[PDB]
Write a protein that binds this ligand. Structure first.
Ligand code: SF4
Ligand SMILES: [Zn+2]
Ligand SMILES: [Zn+2]
Ligand SMILES: [Zn+2]
Lengths: 97, 512, 81, 60, 105, 158, 50, 339
């Protein structure tokens, strides 16, 4: 949440995202902006490139192509906020190596 | 143009299998590229592509041409590809006009793509010899008679030949022979050294080497529009009008371009003698007849003069327009009923007119007629001229003037026609696939009955083979055959409209 | 409140097919010829593939196929069958 | 989720609140008065009664 | 030219004869040879074999180089056809020269 | 007339049966006269005149029947006939005013004649897709499909 | 060097930046967000996350 | 016995691939149709309706009951889509520029672009070029547009095309059959003859008919895009795999899942602004059967145009004062933009 009246923690603005870049800290920036704030986990269908739920892809009618990622919640929100606007980000997956 | 593509894809698959038509639709949706690149875009090997494109060139759905810097590309023929389902009418027409010989000729002509004179005559004779027994045979003479009758009537015509590549451009020959076409010898049959009869074959020396031939499809199309117009006048006035129209057209076959909106006028003096002797009409009565058909406000035929007897000209463009608008009126009549045809005809004649200016004419009251007009916007048959009274362009100060445009409407329906056909055909494929178990079982048991049928026959198998669950299921397959027959009948009983619509739109083209 | 069904009824009924003898003869030729043409070598099925291990029956009931004969003097240089 | 309500019925309701605003009593008097009015507007006799009987029924 | 050219003449100067080249100037620009200018370093036109040598040294493709547009004054000066490489020798505060390569588009 | 609305306007409603029976009966006579005229089968030039019907003639006939107790007017019957041409049923021709007692045009007088339909019902209207209302929404991938469409399955039977 | 390596002097502006970066998300995070996104869908851009 | 199960594979995003969706696909992706203006029942419980907006078969916005579609609570429901359909088609406001550019590019009679085959050759050469960049594609857009605006006739069909002009915000017109500064062509005769009955019934048309223009409204424009030849599409710079041109005209909309738009105060902006669209649709369908004139019909049509535009963003200007918005509102754009 936002502020001390409701115990909102403290904001790490864009201006400290920059200072953290300059040091070349790649694991601390990830830690301090994803795994502590708002990490979330999502299902993506590899065949069609849309999101799915509970290991199912209602679009394609199958449970074989789906996969589970870690993602910031704000990004999960952004995609759902774009599709209805009739702009569709389809995801293309690959191995992690 | 997704509907068209859905048609041709499944048609090429039907006629050549599921391995080739992907290539065909790629060229159809991209136009022309050399083999190196299409191999990559299709992700298919050189040999597969080659054994495909040779076939498509054979039936000339795809062409080839040498381009800049010497590369050779293959050009897809977007129309030819989807003309194929018109073959039934070619066969029907040739069997109607000519004996069965030409019928079996044309089926070979299309099935092989191209044939040389010796090849076609020999093959058609050889299959014919199976059609009678007891040493009876036919000669190449009658087959050649039929073929030349086709040739001078210009229904069957020569292929494009090669240039003199054996004595031109010495050194490294061009990548492709770059065939050439000419009219000078283009209905001229070669003299074959082969003589005699068709010979029956074991199933296990050419003078006309390379002189291939192919049917002239547009010759049929010209004939078809002639058929339509004569049928129309016969329905309207009498069969006698049909004969005289048939008369001046059979004179006008070569006197004007195939797509010209008109013809150069013949005289009633010429028609009075070109008419068959079976008609007893006299010259003065003939002249007064053509006066009526020239005075018909449908104006299929005009006078245009009186030099050397009664001058008369047929108006091809307006004849096509007449039939196309009749088709328009027909479909709206059946799709929504006659009162819709009334209101449509109102605006058709009253080119601009408002709703409060037609309710009297249409004599259908409010709260149903106005809505009836609005639904017609959903199929884009109407338009509204919305002329404004003020520079404000405010809706409170404009006139809502209805309008109709023929070409826009016809162009639209063509998609509906195509998707109708596609749905019907893919429906048949759907049932056939889902019934494949029944079909395989029925074919198996039919083969079992075919075994021992008369040779080595015995009674222990003439009732047991249909005893099982196929007994109530054979009628399901027979009903399936009725469904196949119904939808197939729809295939033939759809595209006559397509012929007239397409002819009208293509003749609308000025090509500046 | 209750959204309409998938298939609403229709007041008009499509016109029944017309019957014709020459035309019926055509439709007959139709389902004949469409099965006949698929035997002509221009038609291509999948090339023979994926056979488990050699057993001599494919020596006696072997399939016979030979390369086609297009016109070698009409198509570009790379045409050799 | 506010129903359109009969035109005469809401006309009466307006009299309800225009009455209670005279004495300018605390608001809950208005709302509960409206509730009682709606409860009374559920019978045939009152609906068919002449408007003068309606003008009095808001008062009571 | 003295005072410029007509639009038709300006148009023709791009397609008159692909077999011929007709670089254009006004006396205005030739009152001084820009190579004598302080603000511009030395250029050299670079040769295909050395092109291969350089892009072998760094393991690049030529689309991965910096750029110089054809219309640029020195580009006009040497009349270089696009698709070539020019060596730039940047002077430094010391004896160390700064060498750098730039591709013409 | 904007207040009386003629004989067709009745009790703030419209006598649909009255105008529809007029339409059907007037074409009944128009086609009857056309067929009887053509049964003469002598010369098309005389059929050019004999096939057409006079508006006064048919008005006299239809008022002789007296189907409607309300009066049938001259221009009324003419406008009733005027619906059939836009119904695609009749033709129109104008001649000199000496025909009939009225001569309903200034120095002229105009006739009607039944017309054959130019073409049979098309093949397209025999296809169920032509009549299908969800045409826009039917797709092989869509939940409404040719592999699922009820109209087609039911159209198999009759 | 950044301002001039593209063969042209490129200002550090909303216009200048559009001519230096190809990716979609980054620009949409600086300025002209709506127009970038809409037209980006029109062109069918793939956008490698790098 | 059991079949081997691939439990989990570590996966990393390679690309984000943007694109549009066609209404057919749009139906395929959603879960339920929503057909009701209202959102709660009339009874005391404040329960939500079964086919209106805010139906919990699309998501959750509270702690005490699950989403029916996936039977889990607000903690982990990923939300699911519905859809609505419009009686008359509509411009997207976003892609409005694209619509007008396409209309300017194509021939209005035959749907073929007005290019000579040499121009097509050059331009497809540029397309094959490796390493096409956004700047470069913008460049081909510029050069295409320039070489095509200066052309007047159509090579393919033999006709000639006017120009497209704005006729008020979010509607467009075309300069086809007006009176021409080059003096009118003989086709003016059939123009004049076409208003004969209009003038006979309404003489005030005659002074006005010389100002007529081509009435390409959204419906007829949509019918036009259904017909572009497959060959031309790439030359419009649209990636044919991203979307066909018909998607620029919309006949269905997605309702976003509840988790985008929670509801406790208990309003939320999109949840109500969307109720107005479904309201107006019900009106025009009721109005569809009324016997009303053409006038108020097209008003109630274009009022959808105003509403959809305000659904995407609220800062439109060309809105007259009598139906100008009464207050500030948060469309989609307002919640993506800003600090
Ligand atoms: S549902 Fe059947 S009849 Fe209707 S369009 Fe689809 S295939 Fe044709
Ligand atoms: Zn999927
Ligand atoms: Zn859920
Ligand atoms: Zn055109």
């Amino acid at each position: 949440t936002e502020g001390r009246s409701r115990d909102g923690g403290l904001r790490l603005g864009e201006m400290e995202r920059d200072c953290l870049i300059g040091y070349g800290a790649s694991m601390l920036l990830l830690e301090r902006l994803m795994i502590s704030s708002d990490a979330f986990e999502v299902d993506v269908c590899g065949q069609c490139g849309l999101l799915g739920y509970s290991g199912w892809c209602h679009y394609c009618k199958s449970s074989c192509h789906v996969s589970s990622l870690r993602i910031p919640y704000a990004c999960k929100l952004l995609f759902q906020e774009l599709q209805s606007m009739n702009i569709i980000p389809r995801l293309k997956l690959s191995k992690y190596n | 143009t997704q509907a068209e593509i859905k048609l041709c894809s499944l048609l090429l698959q039907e006629h050549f299998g599921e391995i080739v038509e992907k290539i065909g639709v790629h060229l159809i949706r991209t136009g022309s590229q050399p083999l190196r690149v299409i191999a990559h875009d299709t992700g298919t090997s050189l040999d597969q592509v080659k054994k495909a494109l040779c076939v498509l060139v054979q039936h000339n759905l795809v062409s080839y041409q040498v381009h800049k810097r010497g590369v050779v590309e293959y050009e897809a023929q977007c129309s030819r590809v989807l003309r194929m389902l018109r073959y039934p009418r070619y066969i029907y027409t040739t069997k109607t006009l000519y004996s069965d010989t030409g019928e079996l000729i044309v089926e070979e002509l299309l099935l092989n793509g191209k044939l040389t004179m010796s090849a076609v005559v020999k093959k058609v004779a050889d299959r014919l010899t199976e059609t009678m027994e007891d040493g009876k045979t036919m000669d190449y003479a009658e087959v050649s008679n039929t073929f030349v009758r086709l040739a001078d009537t210009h229904f069957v015509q020569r292929c494009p030949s090669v240039p003199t590549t054996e004595n031109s451009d010495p050194g490294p020959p061009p990548p492709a022979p770059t065939l050439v076409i000419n009219e000078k010898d283009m209905y001229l049959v070669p003299k074959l050294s082969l003589i005699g009869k068709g010979k029956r074959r074991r199933s296990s020396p050419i003078p006309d080497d390379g002189i291939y031939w192919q049917a002239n499809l547009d010759r049929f199309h010209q004939h078809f529009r002639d058929q339509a117009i004569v049928s129309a006048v016969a329905n309207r006035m009498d069969q006698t009008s049909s004969e005289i129209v048939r008369t001046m057209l059979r004179m006008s076959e070569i006197t004007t371009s195939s797509s010209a909106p008109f013809t150069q006028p013949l005289s009633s003096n010429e028609i009075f003698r070109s008419l068959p002797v079976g008609y007893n009409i006299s010259k003065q009565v003939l002249d007064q007849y053509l006066t009526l058909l020239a005075d018909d406000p449908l104006e299929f035929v005009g006078k245009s003069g009186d030099s050397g007897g009664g001058m008369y000209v047929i108006n091809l463009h307006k004849a096509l327009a007449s039939l196309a608008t009749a088709t328009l009126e027909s479909v709206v009549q059946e799709r929504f009923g006659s009162r819709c045809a009334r209101i449509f005809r109102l605006v058709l004649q009253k080119k601009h007119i408002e709703q409060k200016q037609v309710e009297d004419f249409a004599m259908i009251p409010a709260k149903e007629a106005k809505d009836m007009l609005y639904k017609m916007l959903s199929e884009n048959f109407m338009s509204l001229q919305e002329i404004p009274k003020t520079p404000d362009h405010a809706p409170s100060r404009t006139f809502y003037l209805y309008t109709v445009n023929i070409l826009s409407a016809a162009r639209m329906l063509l998609h509906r026609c195509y998707k109708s056909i596609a749905n019907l055909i893919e429906r048949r494929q759907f049932e056939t696939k889902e019934n494949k178990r029944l079909l395989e079982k029925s074919q198996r048991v039919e083969a079992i009955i075919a075994s021992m049928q008369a040779t080595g026959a015995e009674e222990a198998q003439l009732q047991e083979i249909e005893e099982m669950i196929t007994a109530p299921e054979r009628q399901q397959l027979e009903t399936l055959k009725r469904n196949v027959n119904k939808l197939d009948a729809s295939e033939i009983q759809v595209d006559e409209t397509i012929f007239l619509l397409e002819s009208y739109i293509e003749c609308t083209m000025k090509r500046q | 409140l209750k959204p309409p069904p998938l298939f609403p009824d229709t007041d008009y009924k499509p016109v029944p097919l017309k019957t014709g003898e020459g035309e019926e003869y055509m439709l007959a030729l139709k389902q004949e010829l469409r099965e006949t043409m698929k035997r002509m070598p221009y038609f291509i099925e999948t090339p023979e593939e994926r056979q488990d291990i050699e057993r001599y029956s494919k020596r006696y009931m072997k399939v016979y196929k030979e390369e086609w004969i297009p016109d070698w003097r009409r198509l570009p240089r790379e045409m050799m069958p | 989720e506010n129903e359109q309500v009969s035109r005469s019925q809401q006309r009466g309701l307006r009299r309800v609140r225009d009455l209670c605003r005279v004495l300018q009593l605390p608001p809950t008097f208005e709302d509960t008065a409206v509730a009682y009015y709606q409860q009374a507007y559920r019978h045939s006799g009152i609906r068919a009664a002449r408007l003068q009987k309606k003008e009095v029924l808001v008062g009571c | 030219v003295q005072q410029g050219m007509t639009p038709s003449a300006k148009q023709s100067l791009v397609d008159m004869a692909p077999k011929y080249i007709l670089e254009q100037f006004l006396q205005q620009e030739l009152l001084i040879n820009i190579t004598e200018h302080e603000l511009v370093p030395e250029h050299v036109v670079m040769t295909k074999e050395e092109v291969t040598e350089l892009l072998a040294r760094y393991k690049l493709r030529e689309n991965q180089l910096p750029r110089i547009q054809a219309g640029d004054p020195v580009a006009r000066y040497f009349g270089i056809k696009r698709g070539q490489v020019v060596k730039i020798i940047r002077p430094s505060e010391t004896a160390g020269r700064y060498i750098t390569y730039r591709l013409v588009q | 007339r904007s207040v009386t609305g003629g004989a067709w306007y009745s009790d703030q409603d419209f006598e649909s049966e009255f105008v529809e029976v007029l339409n059907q009966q007037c074409f009944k006579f128009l086609q009857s006269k056309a067929e009887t005229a053509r049964e003469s089968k002598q010369n098309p030039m005389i059929q050019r005149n004999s096939s057409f019907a006079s508006s006064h003639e048919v008005w006299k006939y239809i008022c002789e029947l007296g189907i409607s107790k309300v009066e049938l007017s001259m221009e009324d019957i003419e406008t009733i006939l005027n619906t059939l041409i836009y119904d695609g049923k009749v033709e129109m021709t104008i001649i000199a005013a000496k025909e009939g007692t009225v001569g309903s045009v200034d120095g002229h007088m105009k006739l009607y004649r039944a017309v054959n339909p130019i073409i049979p019902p098309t093949g397209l209207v025999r296809a169920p897709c032509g009549l299908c209302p969800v045409f826009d929404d039917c797709h092989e991938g869509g939940e409404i499909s040719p592999s699922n469409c009820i109209y087609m399955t039911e159209w198999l039977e009759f | 060097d950044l301002m001039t390596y593209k063969g042209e002097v490129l200002g550090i502006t909303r216009f200048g930046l559009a001519k230096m970066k190809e990716s979609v998300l980054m620009l949409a995070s600086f300025e002209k967000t709506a127009d970038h996104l809409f037209d980006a869908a029109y062109f069918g851009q793939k956008d490698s996350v790098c | 016995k059991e079949q081997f199960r691939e439990t989990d594979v570590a996966k990393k995003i390679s690309h984000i691939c943007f694109g549009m969706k066609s209404p057919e696909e749009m139906r395929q992706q959603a879960h339920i149709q929503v057909v009701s203006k209202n959102l709660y029942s009339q009874d005391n419980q404040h329960a939500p309706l079964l086919y209106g907006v805010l139906d919990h078969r699309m998501g959750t916005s509270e702690k005490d009951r699950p989403c029916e579609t996936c039977g889990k609570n607000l903690a982990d429901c990923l939300g699911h889509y519905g859809y609505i359909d419009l009686e008359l088609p509509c411009f997207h406001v976003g892609y409005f520029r694209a619509v007008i550019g396409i209309l300017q590019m194509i021939c209005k009679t035959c749907c073929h672009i007005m290019l000579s085959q040499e121009e097509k050759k050059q331009f497809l050469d540029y397309l094959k070029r490796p390493g096409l960049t956004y700047l470069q594609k913008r460049g081909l857009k510029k050069k295409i547009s320039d070489k095509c605006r200066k052309k007047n006739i159509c090579h393919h069909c033999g006709a000639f095309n006017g120009t497209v002009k704005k006729c008020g915000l979010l509607k467009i017109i075309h300069e086809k059959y007006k009176t021409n500064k080059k003096v009118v062509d003989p086709i003016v005769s059939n123009f004049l003859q076409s208003f004969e009955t209009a003038i006979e019934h309404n003489k005030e048309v005659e002074p006005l008919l010389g100002r007529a223009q081509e009435n390409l409204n959204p419906l007829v424009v949509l019918n036009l895009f259904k017909r572009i030849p497959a060959e031309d599409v790439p030359l419009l710079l649209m990636n044919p795999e991203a979307g066909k041109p018909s998607d620029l005209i919309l006949t269905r909309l997605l309702v976003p899942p509840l988790c985008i738009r929670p509801s406790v105060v208990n309003e939320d902006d999109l949840t109500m602004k969307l109720t107005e669209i479904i309201f107006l649709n019900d009106v025009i369908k009721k109005h569809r059967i009324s016997g009303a004139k053409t006038q108020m019909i097209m008003e109630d049509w274009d009022f959808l145009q105003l509403q959809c535009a305000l659904y995407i963003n609220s800062e439109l200007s060309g809105i007259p004062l009598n139906m100008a918005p009464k207050k500030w509102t948060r469309g989609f754009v307002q919640r993506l933009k800003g600090k």
